[PDB]
Amino acid sequence: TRYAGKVVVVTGGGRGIGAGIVRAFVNSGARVVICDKDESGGRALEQELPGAVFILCDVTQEDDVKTLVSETIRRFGRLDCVVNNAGHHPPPQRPEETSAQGFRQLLELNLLGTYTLTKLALPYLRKSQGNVINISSLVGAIGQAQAVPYVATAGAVTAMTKALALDESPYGVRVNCISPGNIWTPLWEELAALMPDPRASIREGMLAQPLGRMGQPAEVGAAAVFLASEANFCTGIELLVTGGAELGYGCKAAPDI
Amino acid sequence: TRYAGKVVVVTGGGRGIGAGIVRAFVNSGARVVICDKDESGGRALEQELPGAVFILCDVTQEDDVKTLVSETIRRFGRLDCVVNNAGHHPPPQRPEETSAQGFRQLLELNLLGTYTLTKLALPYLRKSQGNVINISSLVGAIGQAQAVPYVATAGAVTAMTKALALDESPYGVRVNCISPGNIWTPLWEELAALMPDPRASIREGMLAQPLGRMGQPAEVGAAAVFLASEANFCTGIELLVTGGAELGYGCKAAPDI
Amino acid sequence: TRYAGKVVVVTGGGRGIGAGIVRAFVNSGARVVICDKDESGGRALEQELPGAVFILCDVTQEDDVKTLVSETIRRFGRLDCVVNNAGHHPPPQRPEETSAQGFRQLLELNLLGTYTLTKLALPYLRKSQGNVINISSLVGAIGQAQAVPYVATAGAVTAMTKALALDESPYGVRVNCISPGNIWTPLWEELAALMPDPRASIREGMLAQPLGRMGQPAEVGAAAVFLASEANFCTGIELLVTGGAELGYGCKAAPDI
Amino acid sequence: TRYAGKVVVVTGGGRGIGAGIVRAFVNSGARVVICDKDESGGRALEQELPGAVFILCDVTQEDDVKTLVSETIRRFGRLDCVVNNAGHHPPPQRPEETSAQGFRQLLELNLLGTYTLTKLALPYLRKSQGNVINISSLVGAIGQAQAVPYVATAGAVTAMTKALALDESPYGVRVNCISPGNIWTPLWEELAALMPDPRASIREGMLAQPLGRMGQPAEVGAAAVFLASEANFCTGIELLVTGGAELGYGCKAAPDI
């Protein structure tokens, strides 16, 4: 009952982290609108979960997002939380093999989708004293190899969260982000499958955390429910869900030349 | 039922933040041992709360802490979480009006109490796959005026949390910290009362947050319950409970000379 | 003679921070190519400074940037350092008064100009074991009010710096950023002049630093010369030139409701 | 001539990082007082360097430090910069194999020496508008395995730097810190020699940086000269001299259990 009577929109909710967030909010007593550009996972998740419904919506298409918000209000009468999870991490990219246009397209997906839904939702979040939860990444904070465009998008989302938190604080709307590290999801599995030795890639991903495993969508989901339902004095924070990957020395490459 | 069947020790649990943490854990279904050097608040809190008991214990006295742990195990059979909250913030201190011996004494209270209880508890936390929650302060991260010794103690606790998280990760024990900013507590009230204009001091404390208010012990308590019960992929994190005080420009003091 | 025999490109070098960086590098013994979209300041700066020349170049126009690099190599025979300073901070913008297209255009200027010049320069920087210096902003790290798009661009630049530092480390090319806070420049003066009380805006900008003043272009310039010429074990750092603005509590807005 | 006419005290200046800092300041034109508890290296360094002198002084002995300051003023007439470098990193320590008394002793050396010299020097630094440079460590920020006491001391020094920067800002005295990562020094060599495979320990230390090498005392020295002589708008900063060790994923330890 932690979030009973509340209405939550989760983008990219059809699989992976987003589906974990959907499940966590349903378990907390909320009604959830699952947004995804792909029907397959999200439609099944509506059938499975009483209290969740699915709306086909590509966050890069502003009229899809306008309809997502208007339909949420028409069907459920209020909006308390938006979780901006839709996004993508490309395969490894050497800097010289990226392009400005590819970078613009990744910004469109990973940064401007979040911007667009947040802007359309905010009038309703002000009415409910609701909150925004943005998914970013640990790599926005610490960098990553072979991911210049992706890392830039994560740095932008984390910073944008802080700016919007300042702007919406007089209106009672909190804005926070979750920065996952390595979470085992279909995207992780798909990216590993492109590598010459998928098994070694997965093992390396596990051992990047002091805990020696990757995280689960359910763990990101619990962090989101905390931010929405109980973190009433938290705004503009970056909640790390990383298993300690940012801690200590690790293998990153006369002794001093 | 989020933390049902678990046993939690909260130091400095007799009033303020610590009492808020005690209440949050009892509400989650845990049994709580309240440690405090003062009988007054903690004894009343035992009488009030089914599931909480009080043990008189000064965290700077190592034999008090040894008995705290042995009595917790004797009475309740397990130990799942220690919350190291006991500590003190002095009134404003100009750097030249501090002393090395006063600094040692503040380290003894604010840093070594945490160290001692954590060390004595860890064998039992390993058995239960339990966790450590250290209270630090935002000022460890950003500094504060007229508080050189206090700020150093907070910086030490936050860093120590990360080191111990690394060391205990192979044993399944998570170690995290909460960094509050301005939380309205008896200590805040007592410190304000020493100022020439207590009301103006309190108002300044409120306006240090974009949210325009101070936080509550219950809000720190909810963050602690999250870290203990649901943050299974979080270790070595610093969870800010600060109302946005670290965000944006504020009043800190030709245009460029 | 700290950077004698070296060749440096500074974008937005015609006034403000960029001109301060140009002057610092000339004083260190380097030859400097001043890039700016405006002829006025940069042309005068070429006439003033032996060792600096001016090339008209808008960093958002990829063929301008290609010619900037090819002309630098044709005229001077090597390239050791690029300083990505060109960019803009808009006047205050409420979140609901921004647009996705305006945000894309600010990303084009503040993020993709840096990306484009860096990509074109890197083959030459690899030959010279040179380095990249990106100008970002403190507000990328801490947020700012009424600046969602700008803050996002700064967060992106700082993060991108870290990613590229990782990628170029095996090739001996360091990539660092400087995050200024409040630096007194023509842009600061122009923005203040748009406010209802310019004098009060300037005073507030000065008092945002514990030092009680804004910084100077020459101070950013000295930080850039350090990063280029002497910081041989620094890569992926964010060097704050902020006068302490990020430190301590300040004015950001019952006591706890 | 960058720091000509200035007087600098460097503690632990007889070897390692401290000796690199001494050399950098002498090369900048300053007169340097080398403090060390051991005569061997520091006495030789006085004979070698015109402009450096050696004073035997253990920073944990407050009367040694009082005499260090009084002798500096008696002999040279002013004091412009103190570099608090003296300290020690123990061999690896499991948390359960540390003691409160050992922790107090390490705090005495690594934190309170810095506190004591800074306090005694500050009246003279106010007269000269001088500055304080504290050596800390990257591990204060990110943690390290098998080093709970050391990490706590580094976290304390970094935080203390920020607090004192706030307090001394109205008096024109800047206070900054340098956080080295892995610097090849006699201490590093001695610690490696205690390991079962010293060569493998050294190689692991080198590969902890994306740059693939450890840093040099001269590189820390150049950072110190920058902070003293040219960083006039920097106060309360943590200048990382780490070769990128904090960046990206590395080896820190079903895929998600």
Ligand SMILES: NC(=O)c1ccc[n+]([C@@H]2O[C@H](COP(=O)([O-])OP(=O)(O)OC[C@H]3O[C@@H](n4cnc5c(N)ncnc54)[C@H](O)[C@@H]3O)[C@@H](O)[C@H]2O)c1
């Ligand atoms: N998995 C990790 O380790 C990890 C780490 C840090 C950040 N992230 C981020 O978290 C988010 C989820 O990651 P994941 O691993 O679950 O990915 P995933 O690919 O498994 O799931 C992403 C979901 O979002 C949907 N989606 C993609 N583009 C969309 C669009 N334009 N409009 C609407 N829906 C869209 C997909 O169809 C899919 O159902 C992503 O933004 C990712 O970048 C993931």
Ligand SMILES: NC(=O)c1ccc[n+]([C@@H]2O[C@H](COP(=O)([O-])OP(=O)(O)OC[C@H]3O[C@@H](n4cnc5c(N)ncnc54)[C@H](O)[C@@H]3O)[C@@H](O)[C@H]2O)c1
């Ligand atoms: N209130 C804030 O804004 C704030 C902000 C950041 C950090 N903190 C820290 O949080 C903790 C709680 O703060 P608070 O405001 O609730 O303080 P408080 O003084 O109101 O409560 C502290 C409690 O700890 C007990 N205690 C003190 N020394 C002890 C010892 N030696 N052994 C056992 N118990 C001891 C006290 O008797 C009291 O019941 C402190 O460590 C404080 O430094 C407080």
Ligand SMILES: NC(=O)c1ccc[n+]([C@@H]2O[C@H](COP(=O)([O-])OP(=O)(O)OC[C@H]3O[C@@H](n4cnc5c(N)ncnc54)[C@H](O)[C@@H]3O)[C@@H](O)[C@H]2O)c1
């Ligand atoms: N002044 C501050 O307090 C401050 C703080 C943080 C960051 N910054 C950033 O530092 C940089 C310099 O700031 P400033 O205050 O000196 O600004 P400024 O406007 O005074 O100077 C900017 C210079 O860059 C040039 N420029 C702008 N767009 C360009 C383009 N497309 N191509 C080439 N040149 C271009 C301008 O013509 C001008 O000469 C900017 O990126 C700004 O966002 C400034």
Ligand SMILES: NC(=O)c1ccc[n+]([C@@H]2O[C@H](COP(=O)([O-])OP(=O)(O)OC[C@H]3O[C@@H](n4cnc5c(N)ncnc54)[C@H](O)[C@@H]3O)[C@@H](O)[C@H]2O)c1
């Ligand atoms: N080497 C690294 O990788 C590294 C990394 C981060 C921080 N640090 C810190 O930097 C400092 C220098 O490290 P190093 O590797 O050069 O060490 P080092 O042991 O080689 O040199 C330390 C010097 O300080 C002196 N010293 C020690 N205790 C003293 C005391 N009580 N009073 C006066 N002088 C004293 C020693 O005699 C010696 O000459 C230390 O504080 C260390 O913790 C070192």
Ligand SMILES: OC[C@H]1O[C@@H](O)[C@H](O)[C@@H](O)[C@@H]1O
């Ligand atoms: O595909 C990898 C993992 O993705 C997660 O989102 C699913 O919940 C898991 O069942 C699956 O193993």
Ligand SMILES: OC[C@H]1O[C@@H](O)[C@H](O)[C@@H](O)[C@@H]1O
């Ligand atoms: O004394 C200030 C505040 O302290 C808190 O710990 C109590 O819960 C409040 O009731 C009280 O107003």
Ligand SMILES: OC[C@H]1O[C@@H](O)[C@H](O)[C@@H](O)[C@@H]1O
């Ligand atoms: O316009 C504000 C300031 O801009 C700086 O770039 C110039 O160097 C100053 O002379 C001027 O006062």
Ligand SMILES: OC[C@H]1O[C@@H](O)[C@H](O)[C@@H](O)[C@@H]1O
């Ligand atoms: O002992 C390791 C290294 O220590 C440094 O301080 C010295 O400058 C080097 O010559 C030496 O190789």
Ligand code: NA
């Ligand atoms: Na359903």
Ligand code: NA
């Ligand atoms: Na009870």
Ligand code: NA
């Ligand atoms: Na010229």
Ligand code: NA
């Ligand atoms: Na000499």
